[PDB]
């Protein structure tokens with residue numbers, strides 16, 4: 001029924017690894033760029 | 049008479065040190081008029097959270113009279129001799145100087161010494177200047193350019209001493225004590241940290257003589273003759289955005305950390321800044337100006353003005369640019385400005401530097417146009433380099449600079465660095481830090 005059974009699973013293995021890695025790296029990058037806004041501070045200094 | 053010959057034939061600058069540690073330097077000319085003053089290595093950077101704005105408060109009393117001679121007496125004496133008494137206080141340097149007839153160089157030196165040593169600090173004058181200073185802070189609060197540079201330091205050196213402004217805080221000015229100003233003076237206005245400079249028609253030996261006579265008060269301990277090294281000020285890539293769409297134009301200042309006085313690279317940075325130059329809506333040159341950025345500014349009406357700078361200090365500095373633009377042209381201006389910075393690091397031309405070098409030479413020669421400007425050079429030079437640097441040396445250094453050198457040095461301080469940004473006014477169009485940060489590489 002599914003002659004590709006074995007190959008499918010070998011791919012699934014690599015998919016899981018690449019995904020773990022890539023998701024992590026991209027998570028960092030997103031956090032990196034957004035750190036600018038995440039830690040950003042502000043104040044309201046109206047005149048006299 | 050060739051440029052070279054004229055540079056070599058310039059009278060040398062004489063320096064002699066007294067036992068108290070003070071240094072006396074001067075450049076002699078044949079001018080009936082002269083300028084002499086004392087350049088102190090003091091300023092806001094030396095102050096702290098409690099006495100910020102003291103050196104400034106002092107700068108206000110330094111002319112309101114001494115012990116030997118109260119206000120009116122002090123003023124009359126100086127006025128009646130046609131002498132001019134000016135001075136200033138900055139972040140790392142203070143100065144009090146007088147313009148007068150060479151014929152009075154000696155009386156002046158006495159006056160200077162009396163000002164720096166015996167300031168009356170009239171208890172009543174203090175409360176009076178307290179209100180004057182408070183008015184000057186409101187006047188300066190409308191000076192965008194200066195508000196912008198203050199903010200630039202406030203963030204570029206956040207957490208440190210260079211973050212503070214020269215004038216000081218409102219709380220300090222409202223509570224600085226007669227004792228605090230006194231303490232300031234005794235702590236900082238000290239012989240080894242001062243420089244008696246003079247230029248014009250004056251005898252170095254007569255200058256140094258009056259100097260010996262009035263700048264006495266030698267020190268006993270070792271702690272009194274040692275020049276304190278200041279703690280480093282950390283640079284921080286960051287931004288401060290003060291928005292007020294009610295303001296007509298917007299001011300923007302971007303900068304990277306600079307090397308600091310003693311570093312030779314400064315000659316290159318100044319050449320680099322010379323390539324980009326500066327501009328303002330009254331430069332007849334218009335669309336033909338050599339500075340590419342200036343050309344684009346004219347063609348696209350990018351700004352009202354812009355200017356590069358390489359502000360130095362003992363151990364650090366701010367290398368950057370500042371522009372004033374309409375709320376709707378900020379983005380293109382910043383785009384082109386950063387673009388040019390990339391060009392510097394990456395595609396500078398021999399032609400470009402050839403021009404920038406000439407421009408730089410005539411600029412250094414211009415900062416020696418009168419007795420006061422020359423005197424300022426001497427004071428600053430000894431105070432920063434511990435020795436005067438001739439125009440011939442500068443020219444020697446400037447001459448060695450080439451395109452490749454500009455690229456490497458510029459790449460060194462600019463490329464892929466995290467800048468410090470200060471934006472004031474109607475700044476909505478100025479894109480975020482991340483976008484700006486990306487304009488720091490490639491391109």
Ligand SMILES: CCCCCCCCO[C@@H]1O[C@H](CO)[C@@H](O)[C@H](O)[C@H]1O
Pocket residue numbers: 002003004005006007010
């Ligand atoms: C389910 C029956 C599997 C028999 C083949 C065993 C080899 C499985 O392995 C995979 O097979 C794929 C296709 O043959 C190849 O393209 C892959 O590179 C290989 O790793």
Ligand SMILES: CCCCCCCCO[C@@H]1O[C@H](CO)[C@@H](O)[C@H](O)[C@H]1O
Pocket residue numbers: 007010011014015018019022
């Ligand atoms: C987030 C998306 C990640 C995709 C990465 C998956 C890459 C898997 O790659 C595949 O592995 C198979 C197993 O041997 C091979 O037979 C295939 O030829 C190969 O292309």
